[PDB]
Design brief:
It has no helix or strand. By secondary structure, it is mostly loops. It is elongated, with a radius of gyration of 12 Å. The PDB classes it as de novo protein. The entry lists the keywords de novo design, machine learning, DE novo protein. It forms a monomeric assembly. Solution NMR structure of designed peptide PH1 (WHMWNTVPNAKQVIAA). The protein: Designed peptide PH1.
Length: 16
């Protein structure tokens, strides 16, 4: 239920 305190592993996406 709780979220872990951690950095995201999301990929960088170009704007537009």
């Amino acid at each position: 239920w709780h979220m872990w305190n951690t950095v995201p592993n999301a990929k960088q996406v170009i704007a537009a």
